[PDB]
Amino acid sequence: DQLIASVVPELLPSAELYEDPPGLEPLPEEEPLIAKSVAKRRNEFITVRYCARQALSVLGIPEVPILKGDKGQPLWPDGIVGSMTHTEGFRGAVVGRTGEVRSVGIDAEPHDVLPNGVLKSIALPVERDELDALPAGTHWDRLLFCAKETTYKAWFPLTARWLGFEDAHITIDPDGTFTSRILVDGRANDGTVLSAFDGRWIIDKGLILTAIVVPKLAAA
C-alpha cells in the first residue's frame, strides 16, 4: 500500500520509507552536498537517495550518486527523469525513462492544517474561495501547497526556470486528481509549450502525496 505507487503509472518505479533505516551512508560523491547541513537534513537526504537508488535499480541502473544542481534539482543518469520528497514520516522517490515520459514530480506533506500564514502566502485569491467550497474532512490548504510543490518539481526539469506559487492556478478535484494551469510563459526546453499539468493525489498513513507525470507528445 505504498503511496507513490498509487498515484503514478506502473512504468515509473518508486520506493518509499516512513523512517530512516539505521546505519545508512551517502555515497562519497554525495557527501559535499550535506557536509554543511544539520543532522535531520543529512538523514532525510541519505534515506531519500537510498530510495531513489532502489527505484533506479528496477530500471536496470546500478548504484550511482545523485547530485544536485544549484537550483536544488536532482541530477539523474542519462535517459532518466525522477523526483524525490521528504517530510517527517516519509521519504520517497520515483524514476522513469525519458523514452517513456517527459518529467515527473512528487511531494509528500503531513495531512494537517498548514502552518500559520502559509495559505495566505501561497494561494491565489480565487484558489482561497475554491478551497473553501471543497467537501469537509480534508486539509485542502495543505493539499494545495503539496500540489504546488509537485508542479514546480515537474516544471523545472523541462524549463530551467522558477515557478512561483502565484504562477500556477491549481484546481483540486475530490476524486483524487488536480490540474495546474500555468499563468506565465510556458516555453519548454524541448521547443513545446507547457500550459497545464494533470496531477493525482492520495491521502493515507497521515500523509498527502501528490504526483504529476508530464507525458511524451504523440509522434508528429
Ligand SMILES: [Ca+2]
Ligand atoms: Ca542550476
Ligand SMILES: [Mn+2]
Ligand atoms: Mn522535505
Ligand SMILES: [Mn+2]
Ligand atoms: Mn513538500
